[model samples]
Target: GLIESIACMQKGLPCMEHVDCCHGVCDSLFCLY
Candidate 1:
């Protein structure tokens, strides 16, 4: 299920990208260094 979900996001599927990339890290945001 996770792999399919990730593939959907990578292909720029509507709403999927936003859902998959949730909790992603960004140093600019000073999170999870």
Candidate 2:
């Protein structure tokens, strides 16, 4: 969901926890880690 992805980005949280728009593991700001 957009909300999930946006929340993660805004909060600087792990993408793995909210990877609705991530391509891979999100250990950083982007989902490349």
Candidate 3:
């Protein structure tokens, strides 16, 4: 399954790409947004 955005994912949420994060920064497999 794909990780859904939190409106784009919250900073603490898991992520795999920049667009997956609200702030456009996905780091260490997590949303740094």
Q: How accurate locally, in lDDT, is each candidate?
A: 0.29, 0.41, 0.71
State the lDDT of candidate 2 residue by residue for 1-33, as single tens digits: 223443223333345454533343454444453
Let me know the TM-score candidate 2 reaches against the reference structure.
0.21
Please give the RMSD to the true structure for each candidate, in Å. 9.1, 6.5, 3.9
What's each prediction's TM-score? 0.15, 0.21, 0.63
Runs off by more than 4 Å, candidate 1:
1-10, 16-33
| Model 1 lDDT tens row, 1-33 | 121333222222233233243343222222221
Which numbered prediction scores highest in lDDT against the true structure? 3
| Clashing residue pairs for model 1 | none
Measured by TM-score, how close is model 1 to the native structure? 0.15
The best candidate in terms of TM-score: 3
Model 2 CA lDDT for position 28: 46
lDDT tens digits, residues 1-33, model 3?
Answer: 234544487888987766778887777878875
Cα RMSD for predicted model 3: 3.9
